[PDB]
């Protein structure tokens, strides 16, 4: 695609600021999935 960008640049006649060609992934995902769970059931141990 930079080849076509250069071909456009040959006449020094661009249409956009910069090069809209994107090397990076189309989707950029950053996520955090954390959880804390504890079973404090009321049951108990009887001791003598």
């Amino acid at each position: 695609t930079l080849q076509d960008h250069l071909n456009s640049l040959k006449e020094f006649n661009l249409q956009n600021m910069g090069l809209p060609d994107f090397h990076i992934p189309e989707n950029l995902f950053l996520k955090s999935d954390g959880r804390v769970k504890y079973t404090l059931n009321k049951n108990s141990l009887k001791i003598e």
């Binding site: 600021m17 950029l28 996520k31 959880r35 059931n41 009321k42």
Partner: protein, 192 residues
């Protein structure tokens, strides 16, 4: 074409059906065939506790209108309100702010904040709920916003139970390259 110049700050108690508006008008104008009315009027609805500010200067295309709406939904058993703010250039809301409060003193407690911008695709959401109960209090967090191909979401939920105690938190911040490119113009009117 003009007989005189007068600047006046005239107060008027205007009627809006049920409501009464303490209207104060500040106008600077020429008097005669030529009118130079540059008016800065400000109106308050003391029956709907609503404030409105108005300015007109056609020479510079000024027809700005700002409204601050407060609507009372509060009662002894429920403290509730609804806030609206209309940012209207040329009387067109290009920025709007809304809030909804619905707090049931018994169990429910709702808070909701919204930001919306139509022309810039900028939207922010801040919503909170707290369902009280003597046995336990249930908490919910909602805060999200979207603008120029960027999605922001924050979801944190906690709950207590005698059997177990449960807590979670999910963080979401995703961006799509093509979607952001389309949403954010990479082209200018006269640049090509």
């Amino acid at each position: 074409e003009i007989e005189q110049y007068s600047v006046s700050a005239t107060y008027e108690l205007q009627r809006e059906d049920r409501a009464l508006v303490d209207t104060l008008k500040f106008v600077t104008q020429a008097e005669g065939a030529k009118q130079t009315e540059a008016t800065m009027t400000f109106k308050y609805n003391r029956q709907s506790m609503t404030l409105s500010s108005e300015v007109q200067i056609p020479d510079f295309d000024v027809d700005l209108g700002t409204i601050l709406r407060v609507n009372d939904e509060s009662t002894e058993g429920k403290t509730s309100y609804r806030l609206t703010l209309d940012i209207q250039n040329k009387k067109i809301t290009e920025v709007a702010l809304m809030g909804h409060l619905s707090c049931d003193t018994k169990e429910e407690r709702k808070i909701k904040g919204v930001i919306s911008i139509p022309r810039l695709q900028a939207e922010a959401r801040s919503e909170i709920l707290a369902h009280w109960s003597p046995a336990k209090l249930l908490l919910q967090m909602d805060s999200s916003a979207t603008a120029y191909g960027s999605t922001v979401s924050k979801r944190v939920a906690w709950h207590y139970d005698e059997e177990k105690i449960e807590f979670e938190w999910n963080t979401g911040t995703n961006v799509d390259t093509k979607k952001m490119t389309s949403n954010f113009p990479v082209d200018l009117s006269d640049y090509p």
